[PDB]
Every structure is written in structure tokens, then in C-alpha cells.
Ligand SMILES: [Cl-]
């Protein structure tokens with residue numbers, strides 16, 4: 602599923618991400634835009650052989666099991682394919698674990714390089730929340 606901007610904001614709002622660990626909703630919408638262009642089915646292979654999955658591009662080296670990242674962890678205790686669903690629940694629940702692990706949203710390279718320190722509130726402007 603390719604979400605619309607305000608549609609995603611509302612779904613993320615409905616799943617507890619607004620101000621989760623102090624990150625306002627616009628931060629999460631901005632991160633999803635530049636990580637996956639709002640597409641739940643996005644995948645990308647990394648040099649080390651791990652793969653990033655879903656709307657927030659969660660990596661198989663630590664967070665999910667895809668059966669082909671030897672020596673990896675599965676800290677969210679899920680198959681990586683669950684992160685490609687049109688239901689974003691699994692992605693949101695895993696993202697909450699990631700952002701709590703000490704490094705905040707710096708775990709998302711696109712957030713660090715394209716959202717951090719910008720007017721992120723613009724990503725939810727005009728939406729009805
Ligand atoms: Cl915001």
C-alpha cells in the first residue's frame with residue numbers, strides 16, 4: 602500500500618507515535634517519506650547482506666528474521682515480511698523498540714540527514730488529526 606501523507610499521519614497517530622519518546626508526529630511522517638516514499642512494500646539490500654523492510658526500512662541485522670542474514674538478531678521477534686503489510690501495526694511496534702534503545706531517531710539515516718533540524722511540523726500541516 603502507498604499511503605497518502607495525511608492518511609499515514611492519522612494511522613501513526615492512532616498507534617501511539619505522536620510524541621513517543623519526545624518525537625512529534627511530523628518526525629515520523631518525514632522519516633517514512635524519505636525512507637520508503639510511504640510504500641509499505643519497499644525493500645533495499647545493504648552491503649553487509651542485510652535487508653531493510655517496509656515503511657520505516659527496519660533492518661534484518663538486528664530487528665527481524667528474514668532467514669538470510671547469518672548471525673543476525675531478531676529483537677522485534679517477527680518475520681521481516683510482517684513489516685511489508687498494509688497494516689502498519691508491526692512496523693510501529695518495532696519502531697517503538699528501536700527509538701527506545703538509546704540513539705533515538707538517529708537510527709534512521711534519512712531522518713538524520715533530511716528531517717532532523719528542519720520544520721518537521723510541515724509534514725502534518727493541513728491534515729485532520
Ligand atoms: Cl510534528
Ligand SMILES: [Cl-]
Nearest residue numbers: 622704705706
Ligand atoms: Cl532522544
Ligand code: NA
Nearest residue numbers: 661665673674
Ligand atoms: Na535478523
